[PDB]
Design a protein around this motif. Structure first.
Motif, PDB file in Angstrom:
ATOM      1  N   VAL A   5       0.844  -1.189   0.000  1.00 26.93           N
ATOM      2  CA  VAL A   5       0.000   0.000   0.000  1.00 26.93           C
ATOM      3  C   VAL A   5       0.885   1.246   0.000  1.00 26.93           C
ATOM      4  N   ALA A   6       1.876   1.261   0.885  1.00 26.84           N
ATOM      5  CA  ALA A   6       2.789   2.395   0.988  1.00 26.84           C
ATOM      6  C   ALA A   6       3.549   2.627  -0.314  1.00 26.84           C
ATOM      7  N   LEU A   7       3.918   1.540  -0.980  1.00 24.44           N
ATOM      8  CA  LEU A   7       4.656   1.624  -2.229  1.00 24.44           C
ATOM      9  C   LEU A   7       3.764   1.935  -3.428  1.00 24.44           C
ATOM     10  N   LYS A   8       2.452   1.749  -3.289  1.00 27.40           N
ATOM     11  CA  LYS A   8       1.555   2.006  -4.414  1.00 27.40           C
ATOM     12  C   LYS A   8       0.657   3.241  -4.312  1.00 27.40           C
ATOM     13  N   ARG A   9       0.338   3.686  -3.100  1.00 27.37           N
ATOM     14  CA  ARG A   9      -0.504   4.874  -2.954  1.00 27.37           C
ATOM     15  C   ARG A   9       0.224   6.056  -3.585  1.00 27.37           C
ATOM     16  N   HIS A  10      -0.523   7.044  -4.064  1.00 23.87           N
ATOM     17  CA  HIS A  10       0.101   8.212  -4.681  1.00 23.87           C
ATOM     18  C   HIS A  10      -0.798   9.429  -4.512  1.00 23.87           C
ATOM     19  N   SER A  11      -0.233  10.613  -4.721  1.00 23.04           N
ATOM     20  CA  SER A  11      -1.013  11.839  -4.620  1.00 23.04           C
ATOM     21  C   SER A  11      -1.778  11.995  -5.925  1.00 23.04           C
ATOM     22  N   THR A  12      -3.094  11.850  -5.852  1.00 27.16           N
ATOM     23  CA  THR A  12      -3.951  11.959  -7.021  1.00 27.16           C
ATOM     24  C   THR A  12      -3.992  13.380  -7.570  1.00 27.16           C
ATOM     25  N   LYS A  13      -3.778  13.512  -8.876  1.00 32.06           N
ATOM     26  CA  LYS A  13      -3.785  14.818  -9.526  1.00 32.06           C
ATOM     27  C   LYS A  13      -5.059  15.070 -10.332  1.00 32.06           C
ATOM     28  N   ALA A  14      -5.901  14.048 -10.445  1.00 26.75           N
ATOM     29  CA  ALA A  14      -7.157  14.169 -11.175  1.00 26.75           C
ATOM     30  C   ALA A  14      -8.116  13.092 -10.698  1.00 26.75           C
ATOM     31  N   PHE A  15      -9.303  13.502 -10.264  1.00 27.96           N
ATOM     32  CA  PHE A  15     -10.302  12.554  -9.786  1.00 27.96           C
ATOM     33  C   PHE A  15     -11.420  12.333 -10.796  1.00 27.96           C
ATOM     34  N   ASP A  16     -12.031  11.156 -10.719  1.00 23.98           N
ATOM     35  CA  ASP A  16     -13.166  10.817 -11.566  1.00 23.98           C
ATOM     36  C   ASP A  16     -14.358  11.343 -10.759  1.00 23.98           C
ATOM     37  N   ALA A  17     -14.901  12.482 -11.171  1.00 18.83           N
ATOM     38  CA  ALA A  17     -16.007  13.114 -10.454  1.00 18.83           C
ATOM     39  C   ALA A  17     -17.286  12.298 -10.300  1.00 18.83           C
ATOM     40  N   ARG A  72      -9.564  21.893  -9.069  1.00 19.31           N
ATOM     41  CA  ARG A  72     -10.280  20.741  -9.609  1.00 19.31           C
ATOM     42  C   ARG A  72     -10.264  19.525  -8.679  1.00 19.31           C
ATOM     43  N   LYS A  73      -9.157  19.315  -7.978  1.00 19.50           N
ATOM     44  CA  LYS A  73      -9.050  18.186  -7.054  1.00 19.50           C
ATOM     45  C   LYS A  73     -10.114  18.294  -5.971  1.00 19.50           C
ATOM     46  N   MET A  74     -10.323  19.511  -5.480  1.00 16.18           N
ATOM     47  CA  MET A  74     -11.315  19.758  -4.439  1.00 16.18           C
ATOM     48  C   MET A  74     -12.739  19.630  -4.982  1.00 16.18           C
ATOM     49  N   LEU A  75     -12.939  20.052  -6.224  1.00 15.75           N
ATOM     50  CA  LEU A  75     -14.262  19.988  -6.832  1.00 15.75           C
ATOM     51  C   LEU A  75     -14.675  18.595  -7.294  1.00 15.75           C
ATOM     52  N   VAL A 188      -7.686  17.535   2.228  1.00 17.68           N
ATOM     53  CA  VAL A 188      -7.465  16.239   1.611  1.00 17.68           C
ATOM     54  C   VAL A 188      -8.647  15.683   0.834  1.00 17.68           C
ATOM     55  N   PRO A 189      -8.645  15.879  -0.490  1.00 20.98           N
ATOM     56  CA  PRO A 189      -9.738  15.360  -1.314  1.00 20.98           C
ATOM     57  C   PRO A 189      -9.571  13.839  -1.353  1.00 20.98           C
ATOM     58  N   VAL A 190     -10.682  13.114  -1.295  1.00 18.71           N
ATOM     59  CA  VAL A 190     -10.656  11.651  -1.305  1.00 18.71           C
ATOM     60  C   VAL A 190     -11.665  11.118  -2.321  1.00 18.71           C
ATOM     61  N   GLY A 191     -11.277  10.080  -3.051  1.00 19.42           N
ATOM     62  CA  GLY A 191     -12.176   9.507  -4.037  1.00 19.42           C
ATOM     63  C   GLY A 191     -11.489   8.446  -4.867  1.00 19.42           C
ATOM     64  N   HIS A 192     -11.662   8.532  -6.180  1.00 21.91           N
ATOM     65  CA  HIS A 192     -11.051   7.589  -7.104  1.00 21.91           C
ATOM     66  C   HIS A 192     -10.386   8.370  -8.230  1.00 21.91           C
ATOM     67  N   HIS A 193      -9.136   8.040  -8.536  1.00 24.51           N
ATOM     68  CA  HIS A 193      -8.430   8.764  -9.583  1.00 24.51           C
ATOM     69  C   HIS A 193      -8.950   8.402 -10.963  1.00 24.51           C
ATOM     70  N   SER A 194      -8.874   9.354 -11.886  1.00 25.55           N
ATOM     71  CA  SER A 194      -9.314   9.098 -13.248  1.00 25.55           C
ATOM     72  C   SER A 194      -8.098   8.661 -14.053  1.00 25.55           C
ATOM     73  N   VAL A 195      -8.329   8.101 -15.231  1.00 25.89           N
ATOM     74  CA  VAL A 195      -7.218   7.654 -16.059  1.00 25.89           C
ATOM     75  C   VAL A 195      -6.373   8.851 -16.485  1.00 25.89           C
ATOM     76  N   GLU A 196      -6.921  10.052 -16.322  1.00 24.41           N
ATOM     77  CA  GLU A 196      -6.199  11.267 -16.686  1.00 24.41           C
ATOM     78  C   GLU A 196      -5.282  11.767 -15.565  1.00 24.41           C
ATOM     79  N   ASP A 197      -5.134  10.965 -14.514  1.00 27.53           N
ATOM     80  CA  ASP A 197      -4.265  11.310 -13.393  1.00 27.53           C
ATOM     81  C   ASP A 197      -2.855  10.871 -13.790  1.00 27.53           C
TER      82      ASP A 197
END
Ligand SMILES: Cc1cc2nc3c(=O)[nH]c(=O)nc-3n(C[C@H](O)[C@H](O)[C@H](O)COP(=O)(O)O)c2cc1C
Ligand SMILES: Cc1cc2nc3c(=O)[nH]c(=O)nc-3n(C[C@H](O)[C@H](O)[C@H](O)COP(=O)(O)O)c2cc1C
Lengths: 216, 216
Positions: A5-17, A72-75, A188-197
């Motif tokens: 988890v530690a090695l795979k988690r990342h800071s998401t730059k784009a979320f799937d709204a 956008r991350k917050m929205l 801290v925005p939380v959700g699911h990253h989009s393929v555009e991340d």
């Protein structure tokens, strides 16, 4: 595996709204915020959990000026958590902590409660009086909470991104935090990253252990 | 179930001095320290990991007088981690971070690296120049690392206890951190609790969500 988890988690730059946390996940992230440890169990914090469009838009107001790159991350995220620290440690709060622990059955004897109160008072006063830095001390406890949170949501399979790139003055005024005795530190925005991340596929980078660790 | 871990992990009050981490676990806790996120991936930290009796004894020097009640935790644990923060953010370190990110393949063009560098410099100067609080800013990143660490070791089935109750001046002197440009913030003994660790059975206590959380 938590290390995976530690090695795979990342800071998401784009979320799937379109992807929202489930009802259970929404309850779980709140539990993570609540159960983080802290010095003397001082829990010197407050959290704003925005999940409605207006709520997130209100938080996003803080992403002004050059911080627009974080708007956008917050929205787009499902839930946006604003980590806040108390601005001053008051006795009322300290009594609250020990009275809650008592209510939760952590003291088998009155002496056990007294020792806990004495210990908390020692640390609280050391910062409020001796060092006059309780504001910094509490904020540090909040950052520890953030660290706990990021790995936790990561372990839940949820994406997120910690944000310091926001105007706290603006965010504080927007939610009238100052009057309530709090100040915003991390969003801290939380959700699911989009393929555009783009950051979802870039390798993680950290300085070598030979540099950051000393074994003895 | 990371939530179960959060509800079960606890601050160990006593460690079994005979139970040591496996070689694999030792490697894993170091990975946790290294891969914690940080503002601009600044990684403004250093970690002392004492596993030998002599090493722990040196760290335990900080559990003096007032803090003597934390000495046994530092001596009986398998591995003791001392979380240290940089005392000042120098350009040299910022260079190291960006050069490592390039080596790790995080940039597609030289222009991309420069953009990343300028951005990091902006946040760095905001604290170094404008706010004059880069020391506190970095200490906050360290606490976040601590938060990540505690949940991680908990998720490993390992016990640990965060310690603020130690004399940092003494610890800093003992390891010549001042000269290295670092200062000790938190000591975290890691290992396996003993049957005497009463805090392993006491119920966890936190204030209610109705107090700490505001949903919007
Ligand atoms: C306290 C803190 C504040 C941060 N602020 C921002 C931000 O404003 N915007 C952003 O996109 N990333 C932000 N980051 C993300 C960092 O750039 C990131 O954690 C780091 O580069 C390591 O990458 P990782 O999180 O993918 O492991 C922040 C991280 C922390 C820990
Ligand atoms: C930054 C920090 C410093 C702490 N220092 C000490 C310490 O010096 N000695 C100790 O026995 N516990 C210490 N604690 C443990 C707290 O009392 C504990 O985290 C809190 O009461 C909540 O209980 P939990 O960790 O079991 O969930 C510390 C915790 C944090 C997060």
């Amino acid at each position: 595996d938590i290390i995976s988890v530690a090695l795979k988690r990342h800071s998401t730059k784009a979320f799937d709204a379109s992807k929202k946390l489930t009802a259970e996940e929404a309850e779980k992230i709140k539990t993570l915020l609540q159960y983080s440890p802290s010095s003397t169990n001082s829990q010197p914090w407050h959290f704003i959990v925005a999940s409605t469009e207006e709520g997130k838009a209100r938080v996003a107001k803080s992403a002004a000026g050059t911080y627009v790159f974080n708007e956008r991350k917050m929205l787009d995220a499902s839930h946006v958590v604003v980590f806040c620290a108390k601005t001053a440690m008051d006795d009322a709060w300290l009594e609250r902590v020990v009275d809650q622990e008592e209510a939760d059955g952590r003291f088998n004897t009155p002496e056990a409660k007294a020792a806990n109160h004495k210990g908390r008072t020692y640390f609280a006063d050391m910062h409020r009086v001796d060092l006059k830095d309780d504001d910094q001390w509490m904020a540090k406890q909040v950052y520890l909470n953030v660290g706990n949170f990021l790995l936790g949501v990561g372990a839940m399979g949820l994406d997120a991104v910690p944000i310091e790139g926001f105007d706290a003055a603006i965010l504080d005024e927007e939610f009238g935090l100052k009057e309530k005795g709090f100040t915003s530190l991390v969003v801290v925005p939380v959700g699911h990253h989009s393929v555009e991340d783009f950051n979802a596929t870039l390798p993680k980078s950290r300085l070598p252990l030979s540099t950051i660790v000393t074994e003895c």
